[PDB]
């Protein structure tokens, strides 16, 4: 069965072993699907990133195909590029672009962001989502950990391992997927749902960017979901600290009724994004410049 699944991935991944052209694997992170390493291209001296995912360790092994779908079919300025995929033993390896500036999480938990920086992040994320949504792709795990940065402050969406596609034949998804504090109310309620869930999740990430934390972070995951599902939309812990342009923006995102939530494409026209600075504005936030 595991062997059965190895054989399936083999048919779909590139041939060979990238250890044959990469040196100096160094682990830099974890997500839920597996680990992330930096490696050095032997011949160029360039750095690439390598996602290793043990087949035996996935809740739903079939989601591993999501990584292949995206590589093959959706590549874009605000999405991390995947180069090649391989089966190495019991692991799937994706060689991809290295975002040397790290995750938004490290910023949000160690400095404060002004509204220029917040708005630049949102603009970059929405450009990614409006295109993905336009083709029936829902990321389903929008949060600061999934947002990665170049050294020069460009912002790219990452970690597609739990995404899904909708379309006319499958207008809606139903699976319980995501990270609790960020999950939309209708998805916690087990209603069929569409791209609207990325928009809610993005709102939570706006609150991360403002308060440093998503709401009900001091509650265990299951209590948080109940309150997400049962309560009025979560509030900023510090409302006096967002301009009413930011408060208005957020009010389009944290909407309980999924039919009234703004879509990515509408949100691109929101005045709050007028404040977005260039990537260079994000650069001072990174660990190496603080």
């Amino acid at each position: 069965s595991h062997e059965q699944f190895r054989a399936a991935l083999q048919l779909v991944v590139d041939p060979g072993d990238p250890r044959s052209y990469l040196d100096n694997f160094i682990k830099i992170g974890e997500g839920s699907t597996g680990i992330v390493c930096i490696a050095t291209v032997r011949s160029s001296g360039k750095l690439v990133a390598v996602k290793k995912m043990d087949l035996r360790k996935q809740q739903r092994r079939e989601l591993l195909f999501n990584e292949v779908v995206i590589m093959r079919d959706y590549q874009h300025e605000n999405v991390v590029e995947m180069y090649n995929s391989y089966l190495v033993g019991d692991e799937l390896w994706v060689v991809m672009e290295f975002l040397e500036g790290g995750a938004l999480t490290d910023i949000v938990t160690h400095t404060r962001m002004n509204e220029e920086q917040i708005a630049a992040v949102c603009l970059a994320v929405l450009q990614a989502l409006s295109v993905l949504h336009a083709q029936g792709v829902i990321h389903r795990d929008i949060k600061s950990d999934s947002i990665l940065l170049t050294h020069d402050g460009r912002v790219k969406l990452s970690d597609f391992g739990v995404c899904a596609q909708v379309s006319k034949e499958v207008p809606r998804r139903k699976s319980l997927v995501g990270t609790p504090y960020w999950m939309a109310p209708e998805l916690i309620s087990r209603l069929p749902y569409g791209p609207e869930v990325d928009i809610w999740s993005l709102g939570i990430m706006v609150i991360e960017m403002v308060d440093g934390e998503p709401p009900y972070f001091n509650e265990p995951p299951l209590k948080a979901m109940k309150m997400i599902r049962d309560n009025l939309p979560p509030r900023l812990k510090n409302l006096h600290k967002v301009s009413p342009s930011l408060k208005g923006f957020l009010d389009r995102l944290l909407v309980r009724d999924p039919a009234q939530r703004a879509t990515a494409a509408e949100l691109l026209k929101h005045p709050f994004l007028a404040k977005a600075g260039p990537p260079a504005s994000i650069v001072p936030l990174m660990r190496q410049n603080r």
């Binding site: 997500g31 839920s32 809740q59 949060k143 391992g161 739990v162 699976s175 997927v177 990270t179 609790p180």
Partner: peptide, 6 residues
Amino acid sequence: RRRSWY
């Protein structure tokens, strides 16, 4: 906790 369900 920052970990995700699937």
